[PDB]
Design a protein around this ligand. Structure first.
Ligand SMILES: [Mg+2]
Ligand SMILES: [Mg+2]
Ligand SMILES: [Mg+2]
Ligand SMILES: [Mg+2]
Ligand SMILES: [Mg+2]
Ligand SMILES: [Mg+2]
Ligand SMILES: [Mg+2]
Lengths: 125, 141, 185, 131, 58
RNA sequence: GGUGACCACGGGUGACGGGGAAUCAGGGUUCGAUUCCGGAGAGGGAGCCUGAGAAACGGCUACCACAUCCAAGGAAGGCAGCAGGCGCGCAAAUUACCCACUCCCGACCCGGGGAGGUAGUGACGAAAAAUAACAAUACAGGACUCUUUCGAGGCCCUGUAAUUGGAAUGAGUCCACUUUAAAUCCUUUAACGAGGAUCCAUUGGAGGGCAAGUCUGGUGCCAGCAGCCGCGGUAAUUCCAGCUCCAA
C-alpha cells in the first residue's frame, strides 16, 4: 500500500510503530462480529442463520470426496457437531469456520457466489 | 548486640565460620560425608548395569504406577533405582545392559509424585534413549 | 609449549530476565525496523554501549583535574566523533550517558548504505553487502556490522567487479545471454 | 601486463648482506594472484638487474582482490646470494639441489650406526645391509 | 513384580498414525525475523476484538 | 629448657604455591592439576661415580613390586617425554611432516633438536556470518475502510504468491596462482554452479510462574506429563498425535 512506500521514502526521519490486536496470542476460532457494535446494539433482534442451500453444498461436497462428518471434522480441526449443524442449516454462520470448510471442500461456498467448480482456481490458478 | 571492636577480627571470623556450618548446603558441601553418601561420587552421570525392572506407585493425590529400574553401578557397585521418563521406553530397554544414568535434576532429592528415586535413565547401550523414542536411531540388534 | 594467544571474550551479554513482553517487543522493533539477523547483534551493540557507559561513569566519579580523567575523556570524545555517534559540538561526558542504542545502529554500514540510497530496501541493502557489491574507499568489504567513520561516510561506492560499478555482469546474465544468442540469430 | 603495476616501499640499501630490502605490492584489478616469475622479470627490467638474483615470496592479497603485497629480495650477485640465503627458495626455482631421505629414515639409520661401536667398516656397513 | 507394567506405551499403541504433510519451507534467519514483525507491528485491523492474536481466530 | 586458648600440638585436606579465572553496585564468594614463575617426582624406597653444577634417572648399584627373552648357563627393563596402545572411568586427539620460523645444544656458517613449528582429529570455547532479495504482477477473500452496492486505500488474510522475472549471488565441483621446508587453508581468480532458488534449521515449549492453544482426534487416575504448583476415570487449554503460535 502507498503508506509503506512513503515510509520507505521516509528513510531520513519520522515513522511510527504501533503494534496491533495481534503479536503473540493464539485463539483458534474467530468471532466474525465486531463485538463492539453488538454491545452498542439494542434495536435489531435477529440473527440471520445460514441458508440450507449451503448445507446441500456441504453434503454433496462430502459425498463427492466421500468423507463422513467426523472425517471432515477432524480435517477442519473442529467438532463433528459444528459440521452437522452447518449442514442442518442453523450454524449461526462464522466466516472462518466456513472458510476452512471452503479450503477443505472443492466448492467455494464462501463468497457471494454459492459455488465455484474449483475454489480460487485449480492449484490456485 | 554483636561484637564491634576494631581489634577483634579473630572473634568475628571464628564465630562466622562456626555459624557457617549450620546451613545444610555448605555443610553437605564441605563435610565430605555427603560426597561419600552420594552414589555418583560427585559425578554428573554414571555407568550402570540393569538388574531388574521395577514398578513403583506414586503418591496418593496421583494414581498411577511408574516404570523404574534397579541398576547396578560399575564403580562401587551398589544398587540404585532409576526412573525412565517416557511413554514406552520401558519396553525399549531390556534386562542386563549398560545405561548412562544421570541425576534426576534436583540435587540428590526425590522429584514429583515419584517417591525415593533421584535418578533418571538416559543413554542406554550406546544409542541414546531419546533417539530410540523418536526413532532417530534404533536398537543395534 | 604453545605459541598461541587464547585471548578471547564474549562479544555480547545475555538478558538476565527471560520472557518479558516489553523487552521482547522493544528488541523486535529494533531488529525488524533495523533488518538484523538475530538479537545476538542487538545484545552485542547494547553490550558495547554498556561498556562505554561504564567507562564514562567511572570517569565522572573520578575527580576533575585528574590527568588520566582529562586524557581519557578527551580520547573517548575524539573516538566517538571519529565514529560519528558524537556531534562535534557536544564534548561533555554526561552527554555520552544520554546516548542511546539506535544511533549506534545507524553507524552500521548496512544502515548507512540504505540511508545514502545506494541500496534500497534495507534488507536488500544488507543482502547486497553480503553480496560484496559495495566497495569501501580502497577495498570491498562484506560485513553488515561494519561501523563507518566520518571520513569514510562519503567513501562508499559500488565495487568495480560487481555489475554495479565497472562491468562484468553476473552469471545469470551470462547464462540467459548465451541462451538468447543460442535461440536467436 | 596491460594493467598490472608494481610498487615498492620501505626500500633500504645494504652491503653486508650485499642486497637491498624493500616491501613490494602489486595491483591486478581483474586478475588472479600474480605468479612470482614475471614479477622477478619486471623488477629486473625496472631495476636494471639480471632476472635471476631476485628472490620473492610471502605474497598475500588484501581482501577483495587487486592489491597484493609481499617481500622482495634483490641481491647483487647470485654468488653472494648463494653464500647468504636460505636454501628452500633456491629449491623453489631450482638452482640448489635438495633431495634427501626423510628425518625418520635418517634417525633410524643414526640409531643403527649408534648400535655398532668403533668399527668404521660396520658403522658405514650399518647403511649397506640395513637400508 | 505385579505385572501391571504390560500397559507401558499403551496410548502410543492406540494413537492413530497421521503424518506430517508437505508444507512450504519457512524462511529462516533475518528472513524469518522479517515477516512476523511485519505481521505484528505495522498492521491496523479495522475491527475490534479486545486485542486478539496474530494467529487471530478470536 | 622451647611452644601454647593471640589455638600450640595432633588429625583431615578431593592442598603443589603465586601470578591470576568465574561472578560483579559496593562488600565479597568460589575456582586456579594446566603452557609464566618457584618447588617436587620420573614405579616405591635407599646409596653412589663423573661432572662446575645430579643424590640425575631417554646415568649407575642394592632391595621391593611388576615385568622381557632365554639352548635354562644368563642377559635386559622404567613413556608423571612425543605419539601411540591396554586399563580406568561420564570424561579426553594422529603410533603425521619439518628443523623453515622461535630459540637451545656442540670443536661449530656447515650437525642435532617428538624443544618447537605445520598439518590431521577436535558443536571445550570464543569472533564473524549463509539459508534470499528487488521490482512490478496485479488479482481475489474480509465486520474491511472511506459515498448508501458501484469507485478508491487510511487496513487484514492467504493464496497465480506466478510465465514472475530477470538481476546478484555465494554452498559445493573447480583453472592456475598464492601459500608453505614442502604442502594445507584463507585471500585472488577463470569454467561450471539456484525458483518449491528441494542446494530443505533445529532444539524445547505453548494452564501459572513463563512466551505461546477455552484447536481437533485419540487415551480415560490408564498410559503418561510435570524443575514446583498440579494435569490425566469420557467434554485433558498440562498425556499421545495433526495444525498453528512462542522461545533462541
Ligand atoms: Mg589446581
Ligand atoms: Mg611453571
Ligand atoms: Mg662440566
Ligand atoms: Mg633426580
Ligand atoms: Mg633419583
Ligand atoms: Mg538454508
Ligand atoms: Mg501448542
Amino acid at each position: 500500500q502507498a503508506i509503506l512506500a512513503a515510509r520507505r521514502a521516509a528513510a531520513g526521519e519520522d515513522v511510527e510503530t504501533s503494534k496491533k490486536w495481534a503479536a503473540g496470542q493464539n485463539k483458534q476460532h474467530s468471532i466474525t462480529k465486531n463485538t463492539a457494535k453488538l454491545d452498542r446494539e439494542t434495536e435489531e433482534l435477529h440473527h440471520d442463520r445460514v441458508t440450507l442451500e449451503v448445507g446441500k453444498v456441504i453434503q454433496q461436497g462430502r459425498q463427492s470426496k466421500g468423507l463422513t462428518q467426523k472425517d471432515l471434522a477432524t480435517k477442519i480441526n473442529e467438532k463433528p457437531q459444528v459440521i452437522a449443524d452447518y449442514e442442518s442449516g442453523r450454524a449461526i454462520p462464522n466466516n472462518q469456520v466456513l472458510g476452512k470448510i471452503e479450503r477443505a471442500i472443492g466448492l467455494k461456498l464462501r463468497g457471494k457466489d454459492i459455488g465455484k467448480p474449483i475454489e480460487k482456481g485449480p492449484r490456485a490458478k | 548486640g554483636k561484637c564491634r571492636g576494631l581489634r577483634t577480627a579473630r572473634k568475628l571470623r571464628s564465630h562466622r565460620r562456626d555459624q557457617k556450618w549450620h546451613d545444610k548446603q555448605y555443610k553437605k558441601a564441605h563435610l565430605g560425608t555427603a560426597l561419600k553418601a552420594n552414589p555418583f561420587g560427585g559425578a554428573s552421570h554414571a555407568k550402570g548395569i540393569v538388574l531388574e525392572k521395577v514398578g513403583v506407585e506414586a503418591k496418593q493425590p496421583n494414581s498411577a504406577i511408574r516404570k523404574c529400574v534397579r541398576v547396578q553401578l560399575i564403580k562401587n557397585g551398589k544398587k540404585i533405582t532409576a526412573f525412565v521418563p517416557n511413554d514406552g521406553c520401558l519396553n525399549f530397554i531390556e534386562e542386563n545392559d549398560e545405561v548412562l544414568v544421570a541425576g534426576f535434576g534436583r540435587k540428590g532429592h526425590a522429584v514429583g509424585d515419584i517417591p525415593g528415586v533421584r535418578f533418571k535413565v538416559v543413554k542406554v547401550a550406546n544409542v541414546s534413549l531419546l533417539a530410540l523414542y523418536k526413532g532417530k536411531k534404533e536398537r543395534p540388534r | 609449549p604453545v605459541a598461541r594467544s587464547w585471548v578471547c571474550r564474549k562479544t555480547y551479554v545475555t538478558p538476565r530476565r527471560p520472557f518479558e513482553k516489553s523487552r521482547l517487543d522493544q528488541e523486535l522493533k529494533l531488529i525488524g525496523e533495523y533488518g538484523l539477523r538475530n538479537k545476538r547483534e542487538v545484545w552485542r551493540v547494547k553490550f558495547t554501549l554498556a561498556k562505554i557507559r561504564k567507562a564514562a561513569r567511572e570517569l565522572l566519579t573520578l575527580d576533575e583535574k585528574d590527568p588520566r580523567r582529562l586524557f581519557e575523556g578527551n580520547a573517548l570524545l575524539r573516538r566517538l566523533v571519529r565514529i560519528g555517534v558524537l556531534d562535534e559540538g557536544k564534548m561533555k561526558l554526561d552527554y555520552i550517558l544520554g546516548l542511546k542504542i539506535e544511533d549506534f545502529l545507524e553507524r552500521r554500514l548496512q544502515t548507512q548504505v540504505f540511508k545514502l540510497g545506494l541500496a534500497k530496501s534495507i534488507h536488500h541493502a544488507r543482502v547486497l553487502i553480503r553480496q560484496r557489491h559495495i566497495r569501501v574507499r580502497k577495498q570491498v568489504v562484506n560485513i553488515p556490522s561494519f561501523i563507518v567513520r566520518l571520513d569514510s561516510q562519503k567513501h562508499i561506492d559500488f565495487s568495480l567487479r560487481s555489475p554495479y560499478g565497472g562491468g562484468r555482469p553476473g552469471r545469470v546474465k551470462r547464462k540467459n545471454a548465451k541462451k538468447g544468442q543460442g535461440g536467436a540469430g | 601486463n596491460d594493467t598490472v603495476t608494481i610498487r615498492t616501499r620501505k626500500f633500504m640499501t645494504n652491503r653486508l648482506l650485499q642486497r637491498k630490502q624493500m616491501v613490494i605490492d602489486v595491483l591486478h584489478p581483474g586478475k588472479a594472484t600474480v605468479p612470482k616469475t614475471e614479477i622477478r622479470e619486471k623488477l629486473a627490467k625496472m631495476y636494471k638487474t639480471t632476472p635471476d638474483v631476485i628472490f620473492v615470496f610471502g605474497f598475500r592479497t588484501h581482501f577483495g582482490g587487486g592489491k597484493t603485497t609481499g617481500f622482495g629480495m634483490i641481491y647483487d650477485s647470485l654468488d653472494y646470494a648463494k653464500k647468504n640465503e636460505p636454501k628452500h627458495r633456491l629449491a623453489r626455482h631450482g638452482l640448489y639441489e635438495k633431495k634427501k631421505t626423510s628425518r625418520k629414515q635418517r634417525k633410524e639409520r643414526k640409531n643403527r650406526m649408534k648400535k655398532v661401536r668403533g668399527t668404521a667398516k660396520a658403522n658405514v656397513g650399518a647403511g649397506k645391509k640395513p637400508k | 513384580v505385579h505385572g501391571s507394567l504390560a500397559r507401558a506405551g499403551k496410548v502410543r499403541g492406540q494413537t492413530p498414525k497421521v503424518a506430517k504433510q508437505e508444507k512450504k519451507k519457512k524462511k529462516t534467519g533475518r528472513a524469518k525475523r522479517r515477516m512476523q514483525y511485519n505481521r505484528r507491528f505495522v498492521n491496523v485491523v479495522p475491527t475490534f476484538g479486545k486485542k486478539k492474536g496474530p494467529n487471530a481466530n478470536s
